Copies of this chain bind each other. A is one copy, B any other.
Amino acid sequence: LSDPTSTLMFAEAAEAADVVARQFSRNHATMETLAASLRAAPPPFVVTCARGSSDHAATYGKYLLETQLGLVVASASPSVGSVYAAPLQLRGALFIVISQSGKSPDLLRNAEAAKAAGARVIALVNVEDSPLAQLADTVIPLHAGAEKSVAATKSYLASLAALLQLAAYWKQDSSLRAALDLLPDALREAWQCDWSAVTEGLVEATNLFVLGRGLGLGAAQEAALKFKETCSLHAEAYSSAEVKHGPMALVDRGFPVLAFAQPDETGAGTRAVVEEFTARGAQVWMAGAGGNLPVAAAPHPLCAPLLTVQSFYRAINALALRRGFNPDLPPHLNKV
């Protein structure tokens, strides 16, 4: 269509700032109670349990809790069908299930097993009366409302925001707490960032790397999923820590790079790496670290990936339509 604003993906992504504001207001005391309980009985480590977009949120959760609380974060394996020669030793661990609908039988079985093993199960979940919420020791509703687009947007940003409020309150980080009050306005600014250069440059694309590292890796993972689902583009997320492998093998004219960088110039590789990509004739866009894509000013560095994703949703919505796809309908059913 000729009006990018007319998609549900656009309307729902635009809601994210209001979603985050009301989520933090509604969940404040519940999060404080959970945070106090974790300080009183510190878990030995954390486990995230999630699929799809929610697992890309778990990637961000890992970075947040490892860097801010100093706790190791592992991933559960809900739908892998492992047979345990030994029960998994989860006693006292914090077991974080992230799920939009909270109904996946695999997630439920994994959460039940974690509880039986003595873990504390918390659910970051949008559907508050879901089977997962009923199971959890503590429920953190995402408060994202209904998503009618098949493309997840505000629900993913809400998952990141809930992890951030958990980290802020658990840590008692007064600086991050103050930045949470500023985060909705920053998301509103991020929604206005002009990423038309990458929309225009990818109309004819057939391959892409989305690079990220550390704080922004989960955002790169989600961006690549969005390119696959809405644009029928083989975008692949890749850690810039491993740029000497896949990206150095394949980046070329006709195989471009979108990089999410932190202000310390990490997330795209070194200057020499980017220069090699450019010398090959590859298009390279970078959001962050003075890159050629404009980004909103983050009120706290840990907020930055939410802003990056908020900006990217507008660019990818526009790109889907330019490529002849309706981002509100499933792949293979959405060519216009």
Contacts and interface: CB of A to CB of B under 8 A. Distances in A.
Interface of A: 44-45, 47, 51-53, 55, 59, 62-63, 66-90, 93, 106, 171, 173, 206-207, 213-214, 217, 224-225, 228-229, 232, 234, 236, 239, 241-242, 244-250, 252, 255, 262, 264-269, 280, 331-332
B70 A82 contact: no
A164 to B, nearest CB: 13
A268 B75 CA distance: 21
Contact of A80 (B88, B89, B93, B214): B214
A229 B245 contact: yes
A54 to B, nearest CB: 9
B80 A213 contact: yes
B331 A249 contact: yes
* Across the A-B interface, the 9 shortest Cβ-Cβ residue pairs: A70-B86, A249-B331, A79-B241, A74-B74, A52-B245, A80-B214, A78-B241, A79-B239, A228-B249
5 contacts: A44-B45, A63-B77, A79-B239, A79-B241, A252-B332
A88 B71 contact: yes
A217 to B, nearest CB: 7
A8 to B, nearest CB: 18
A83 B217 CA distance: 12
Copies per assembly: 2
A83 B213 contact: yes
Contact of A74 (B73, B81, B239, B280): B73
Nearest to A208: B234
A70 to B, nearest CB: 3
Nearest to A214: B80
Contacts of A72: 45, 47, 74, 76, 88-90, 93
A43 to B, nearest CB: 10
Contacts of A173: 85
Contact of A246 (B206, B225, B242, B266): B225
Given A67-B82, A331-B249, A207 B228 contact: no
A262 B80 CA distance: 11
Contacts of A85: 67-68, 70, 171, 173
B67 A83 contact: yes
Contacts of A249: 228-229, 232, 331-332
B80 A217 contact: yes
Given A74-B45, A80-B59, A89-B44, A331 B267 contact: no
Nearest to A53: B245
Contacts of A245: 51-53, 225, 228-229, 331
Contact of A213 (B81, B171, B232, B239): B81
